[PDB]
């Protein structure tokens, strides 16, 4: 009379399915999820500096639309633009809007340094009823609407060297009147021109006269342009009409800053990874929440689940 | 699996074994019993923890990127921005699918392997004092009291002690 | 007197070579090809709606070149442009041709809705001998060449609101005469201007007078532009000369539509995947036929063959 | 392969075996014969079908994309469109090359494994009534008529029946 | 009296750590490095034709800045632009500079064929003290500064058909004067215009009058444009002022040519792969030297080392020490 | 490894073995000795050379590409150029990491496998004339002079010759 000694392994009554080279579904004792598929629905306010745009786009805060004046001193790691944002100043467009938005977003600051441009023989500080400030007419805070002084608008010709060790961003514009009467009334000359240049590059813009649809009372428009001036380079602005002049420059940085479109509310919590749907944990290597992310994030994939087996094949009794 | 132990010559797992992944069931003079093998359990879980920690190594921190949703039709530049992102996403999705498939195939095979290793180790311990029944069980051809079983299980079984007894019972 | 029992496996007399981790060539009993390297040479007309452009580019069908009138209101999943296509109407260019072609191709329709523009004090329906329609002079069917009425061309200023719930695509143009005589003869004013705008955008184009090379009798040119008008927005067209006016708008859609350059003939058959070389089967995961594809297609790779082993190592007798 | 059976301790394959992938050849009192083993054959082909169906899962459908041939020189935008596509193609070509290499290595190893599994299973069936010659053949130490062979092949061989006979012929 | 036969494997005294599926570090007997992480610091002059730009950008050699005249008609597989390069001719800009640089770099040649343009009623060969050539005033060698003849600048209207079987690249420009006085003094008309066209395309540029920053004595500028003319097509140039005319065309090719920014010296050696840091060997499949490469190169990766095991697991005899 | 020989039932490697990767140590009547097994050594090194030559197959040559460093801020087009390259680099870096991990796991397992193959081959040669001690060593139950060892090592060992002698030494 001897003995029996049986070797074996564990099992559980309710295993989990995983995929392999040979099987789309095979049962193992345990697995762990590699795709983050859910969010809190909220953007955590730490550890990244989140700036809620509320009613303002980044570009409107940059130009200085009055309802966006509260953003003047502001910095961010992530600027959040809301779908309810609206413009409420002179009607404008930005050729290459996307690029200007990107480069400002990436700089991470709206820090503005006033420069003493001398605009000889023109009237400064033009305003409009489309852009109210207090009881009167007003304008973008960072732009200077120049018009005739007396009966003349001379050739404006100014320079501003960059003797700092950072890049300067200059925002300027061109006014597009709706009629010839308004062109000559404001700028004397029948056709304006704006030429803004540095040592190696130049932008020359001709204004366009004509009737457009009415926005906040007006058929005229401003087109917004930008010029970056590097250390050791120099800005020159030359115009005989229609110049919407810079008041100064924005100090540029480089770093981790960006921008996101989202309607998710901001909350007091900690999350490295932010998506437009809200913050997500980053303990998993993949996520299926949103291809738009900011921070230390799982990589976006199309699968909503992927199981890594953490145990043997489950062969129940 | 490649070794043919788990879901192979061992018919099934033991739901009753909750203190280990691999182990021993016996019948002798003194009744029946069950014990986990710690070493083989450890070798499997340490390998699985190892691969788990390699797979979840946080490796990706991105800040300013390209736009990926667009409110307006633009044509050429937007076609390219979308195609770039779609290409990336498909390549990463493929990576993720392949990774889990390879990892999981390998996890099944390594767990099967550890079962097989324990079985071959036990058979070697027992020398000529036992025979492989072919279902994961050894018939031991001698009196093996509970002390003798614990000796097999904890690695201290001297086969010479029982050899003559067992050789005669076998032949 | 005993017995021998030998375990073994099969072999075949003619095995195939495959690649592994350790061997670039090793023999197995069987394998299957993973790279599709051939085509029928024909584009199957199902299950995708194929529209053969024949003698017409998509853009010529859009503008309404007379030999392309047969394409009016057409739809497609895939528009096929042939290398024999030719233009046979007023000579033109499209700044950002590639973008207009892309966005129309992707919309998948040339469905055109005529709108009642009122053009006060100008002559409509201008034609040219470079664009014959029947026996006499003609023009692009979707465009309206406006010229003087009597001895005047007044400032045109018209609107079309978008009160529908879909986006409208407007195609319009600007005429570039070859001489001053032609300019004043057609438009009175010595210099034209075309301003087309919405609430959010504006395009102003000044015509350029001068010789270009002769095409179908003409050194003048038309430049083609486009404007999308969203629901609730409004189109305004303002001009004192050189306007090539829209007659209406194209309905835009989003979906699976595209365009392909190919000379492969169309055939009555079924294939999910289309390449410029023709349709290809999609049972294999990879293909080396063409990087240009449309539909459910194998992924393009550089290898012309890859063998997946479907059997054991072949060790013949 | 990793198990050392196919192109290992089994010298070669059998071209004459056409009704299965693995099987048995015997010599006894009544002559010689051949039979396929269905179970081992099935385990291999089921695994190969599985991987074949995973590899050919149709997984991409694309419509409007970017242009990839150009009739004019343009510079920067076209450099980028081409570079995007060339990058994609190289990455997919790499994926394809790696995939087949891993799959094929694995297919060779799993087929080798099933051969080995059948061999170990047979050895276990035979207990002490046979010895491994080392070339994939067992010398059986008793009278094994055609009924006895079919019993080994179809899983019904009782080793106790022939044990005394075989033990004496061996020792 | 029996015998013992022990099976075993080797071990080595100094193994190496590698990564696996299950271990981020485990010891094997040997391994080999898959990431090339070093360079000589020098660009090998073979087997690719390397053209050192020295003091010249490709664009300056193209236009024919006088200190770049030595590059006339040059060819290259790789043009190397140095950080010391400088312009020393009429101040200019190129809208879409990057594209012109790219397409010329890729063509691999500055081969220039002079054509007999007839410029009736204008003065040719204008020069400036900002672009000295020998002791006196000069200009870009491939461009022709046209100004008034007597007291008139008529409408210029010229043609050049392409009756060859290759594409022609024409480089031309527009002069932007700093004052009205300069505009009328040089071109009579108060506003110029340049229209350059082929059958299917056209570019019209209006000059802009105004100061830009002073460079080598001048606040004026030239803007540079380009037009490719295909076989069977025709170039037409139409202008009533401010035309900086082409003297001919550049022959375009297609092939393996490119451009690289680098300060690495060029040396006599053989290397298929070139980076801005210098040439690197290409025996390894990966490299971490530079994402900018030219030739048969390992693929750039972020890791500075990756070890491929070339031996078994290294299991030393444990000691009581 | 998957087979349990290297760093498994074989306690450690032999630093003293310098003419091969796998081999034999013996003790008999005439003393002790060591010899490399050439075949198993060759099977491992051939497989490792094979994978090494597959991994270093030169397969990319690129000429004119896109720019990857920029002296000016430009916005949209430059964002895309950088994102394209960054994407590529991450994907290739992943490929490289996975490749070495898979290769190395496999190299460890194939070397373990060849050790195991040699061990099973030897055990089969010896038939009933020896027993597996379980530590990589066989106790041989007969007089095995140096000629007899070389016969086991070079594949010529006839087990029938020593079987009766060994069977009697094994069973009492
Ligand atoms: C429009 O505005 C700008 C800015 O006011 C103006 O450009 C400036 O003009 C002056 C005079 O042409 C430039 O001064 C030069 O500066 C350089 C150093 O960078 C010096 O080498 C020059 O000195 C020599 O030449 C002078 C002759 O003018 C001599 O008087 C002198 O002794 C030296 O020999 C010279 O002083 C200045 O650089 C520019 N600044 C910029 C930023 O461009 C422009 O002239 C105005 N245009 C009009 C039409 O008014
Ligand atoms: C060229 O044509 C243009 C388009 O017809 C002319 O613009 C129109 O000019 C009139 C009078 O100057 C504007 O009248 C204003 O209308 C607003 C209403 O604003 C909007 O609100 C409704 C919804 O409530 C919306 O459906 C309308 O379309 C408007 O956009 C009134 O409340 C004001 O009191 C004001 O009088 C028109 O709005 C304006 N139309 C457009 C579409 O812009 C333009 O004057 C012509 N130019 C010349 C030089 O003759
Ligand atoms: C500016 O210069 C160009 C080139 O010198 C002039 O264009 C040329 O115009 C003539 C007609 O005046 C075209 O000739 C025609 O050719 C057809 C056959 O192709 C023939 O059947 C007709 O009888 C007619 O002669 C010629 O093709 C055209 N050349 C080019 C290259 O386009 C242009 O007219 C000049 N304008 C001024 C105002 O100087
Ligand atoms: C273990 O692997 C290492 C690799 O990490 C091997 O070292 C390499 O071995 C060879 C020498 O046999 C060297 O290649 C030779 O280089 C010289 C010039 O350096 C050249 O003239 C020869 O034609 C040949 O290419 C190689 O440089 C060397 N590399 C390093 C980094 O040491 C080592 O030999 C391997 N050990 C064993 C036992 O296999
Ligand atoms: C499908 O069509 C493409 C496009 O013409 C073919 O590619 C050409 O053929 C050879 C190389 O195979 C070269 O000489 C040409 O330059 C290729 N052109 C391009 C644009 O790549 C391709 O071979 C065709 N394939 C099949 C199977 O028909
Ligand atoms: C090759 O050159 C690159 C680029 O010039 C070097 O990497 C740069 O080194 C600086 C040191 O200040 C780092 O801070 C930057 O992160 C790197 N710059 C860029 C643009 O990547 C690289 O180290 C060189 N490699 C070798 C082997 O020489
Ligand atoms: C399953 O695996 C995960 C990850 O290793 C672990 O945290 C969890 O406890 C396991 N579950 C069970 C029931 O063992
Ligand atoms: C910005 O800073 C200044 C000076 O510190 C302060 O007086 C001003 O109110 C600030 N603006 C806003 C919008 O907070
Ligand atoms: C996140 O947002 C996107 C876009 O609004 C949506 O399609 C997606 O399904 C959301 N996912 C989750 C998990 O909330
Ligand atoms: C290979 O593939 C299939 C079996 O799945 C069959 O059609 C073909 O005849 C096979 N060839 C050989 C030689 O086995
Ligand atoms: C185009 O679209 C509609 C038909 O749905 C109609 O208004 C119009 O007459 C159509 N024209 C042609 C030629 O089909
Ligand atoms: C298997 O073999 C036996 C003996 O050769 C045969 O008679 C029998 O029908 C077979 N199957 C079973 C299940 O007994
Ligand atoms: C450049 O090459 C062309 C034609 O090959 C020749 O006519 C011209 O004179 C050459 N110039 C120089 C400086 O070599």
Architecture overview:
The complex is a heterohexamer, with three copies of chain A and three copies of chain B. By secondary structure, chain A is mainly beta. Chain A has a domain at 49-264: Haemagglutinin, alpha/beta domain, HA1 chain (Hemagglutinin (Ha1 Chain), Chain: A, domain 1, Alpha-Beta Complex), CATH 3.90.209. Chain A is built from three helices and 31 strands. In chain A, the strands form ten sheets. In chain A, strands 9, 10, 14, 17, 20, 22 and 23 form a seven-stranded mixed beta sheet that branches. Chain A has a four-stranded antiparallel beta sheet with strand order 16-21-18-19, with no helix packed on it. A three-stranded parallel beta sheet of chain A has the order 5-28-30, with no helix packed on it. Chain A is elongated and about 125 Å long. With 171 residues, chain B is α+β, with helices and mostly antiparallel strands. Chain B has a single domain, classed as Hemagglutinin Ectodomain, Chain B, CATH 3.90.20. Chain B has helices spanning 38-55, 76-126, 146-153, 159-170, and strands at residues 22-28, 31-36, 61-62, 130-132, 137-140. In chain B, strand 4 (130-132) and strand 5 (137-140) form a beta hairpin. Classes of the chains: A mainly beta (317), B alpha+beta (171). Chains in contact: A-B, A-C, A-D, A-E, A-F, B-C, B-D, B-E, B-F, C-D, C-E, C-F, D-E, D-F, E-F. The interface between A and E is medium-sized, with 17 and 13 residues. One 2-acetamido-2-deoxy-beta-D-glucopyranose (NAG) is lined by residues 12, 29-30, 310 of chain C. Chains B, D: It comes from Influenza A virus (strain A/Hong Kong/1/1968 H3N2).
Gap between N and C termini of chain B: 35 Å
The CATH topology of the domain at 49-264 in chain A is what?
Hemagglutinin (Ha1 Chain), Chain: A, domain 1
N/C terminus separation of chain A: 28 Å
- The biggest beta sheet of chain A, please? 7 strands, mixed
Q: Name the quaternary structure.
A: heterohexamer
Count of β-strands of chain B: 5
The coarse silhouette of chain B is rod-shaped
What structural category arises from helix and sheet content of chain B? alpha+beta
Chemical compounds bound to the protein: a molecule of 4 linked components (NAG-NAG-BMA-MAN), a molecule of 3 linked components (NAG-NAG-BMA), a molecule of 2 linked components (NAG-NAG), 2-acetamido-2-deoxy-beta-D-glucopyranose
Label the CATH architecture of chain B.
Alpha-Beta Complex
Count interface residues per chain for the largest interface.
Answer: A-B, 64 and 75 residues
- Class from helix and strand fractions of chain A: mainly beta
Structural Rg of chain A = 29 Å
């Amino acid at each position: 009379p001897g003995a029996t000694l049986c070797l074996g392994h564990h099992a559980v009554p309710n295993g989990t399915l995983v995929k392999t080279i040979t099987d789309d579904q095979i049962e193992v004792t345990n697995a762990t999820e590699l795709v983050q598929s859910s969010s809190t629905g909220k953007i955590c306010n730490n550890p990244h500096r989140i700036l809620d745009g509320i009613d303002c786009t980044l570009i409107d805060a940059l130009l200085g639309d009055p309802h966006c004046d509260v953003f003047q001193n502001e910095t961010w790691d992530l600027f959040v633009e809301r779908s309810k944002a609206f413009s409420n100043c002179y009607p404008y467009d930005v050729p290459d809007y996307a690029s200007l938005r990107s480069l400002v977003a990436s700089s991470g600051t709206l820090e503005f340094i006033t420069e003493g441009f001398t605009w000889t023989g023109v009237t400064q500080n033009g305003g409009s009823n489309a852009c109210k400030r207090g009881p009167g007419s007003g304008f973008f805070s960072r732009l200077n609407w120049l018009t005739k002084s007396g009966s003349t608008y001379p050739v404006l010709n100014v320079t501003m060297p960059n003797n700092d060790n950072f890049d300067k961003l200059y925002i300027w514009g061109v006014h597009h009147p709706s009629t010839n009467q308004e062109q000559t009334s404001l700028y004397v000359q029948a056709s304006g021109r704006v030429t803004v240049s540095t040592r190696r590059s130049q932008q020359t813009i001709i204004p366009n006269i004509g009737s457009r649809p009415w926005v906040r009372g007006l058929s005229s428009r401003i087109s917004i342009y930008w010029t970056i001036v590097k250390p050791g380079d120099v800005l020159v602005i030359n115009s005989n009409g229609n110049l919407i002049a810079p008041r100064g420059y924005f100090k540029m940085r480089t770093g981790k800053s960006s921008i996101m479109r989202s309607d998710a509310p901001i909350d007091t919590c900690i999350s490295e990874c932010i998506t437009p749907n809200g913050s997500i944990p980053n303990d998993k290597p993949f996520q299926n929440v949103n291809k738009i992310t900011y921070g230390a994030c799982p990589k976006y994939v199309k699968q909503n689940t992927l199981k890594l087996a953490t145990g043997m094949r489950n062969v129940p009794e | 699996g490649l070794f043919g132990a788990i879901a192979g010559f061992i018919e099934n797992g033991w739901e009753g074994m909750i203190d280990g992944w691999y182990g021993f069931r016996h019948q002798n003079s003194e009744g029946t019993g069950q014990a986990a093998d710690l070493k083989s359990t450890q070798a499997a879980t340490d390998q699985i923890n190892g691969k788990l920690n390699r797979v979840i190594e946080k490796t990706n921190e991105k800040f300013h990127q390209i736009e990926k949703e667009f409110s307006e039709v633009e044509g050429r530049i937007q076609d390219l921005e979308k195609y770039v992102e779609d290409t990336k996403i498909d390549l990463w999705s493929y990576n993720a699918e392949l990774l889990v498939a390879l990892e999981n195939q390998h996890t099944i095979d390594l767990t099967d392997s550890e079962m097989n290793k324990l079985f071959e180790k036990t058979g070697r311990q027992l020398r000529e004092n036992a025979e492989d029944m072919g279902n994961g069980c050894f018939k031991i051809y001698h009196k093996c009291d509970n002390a003798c079983i614990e000796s097999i299980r904890n690695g201290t079984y001297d086969h010479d002690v029982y050899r003559d007894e067992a050789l005669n019972n076998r032949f």
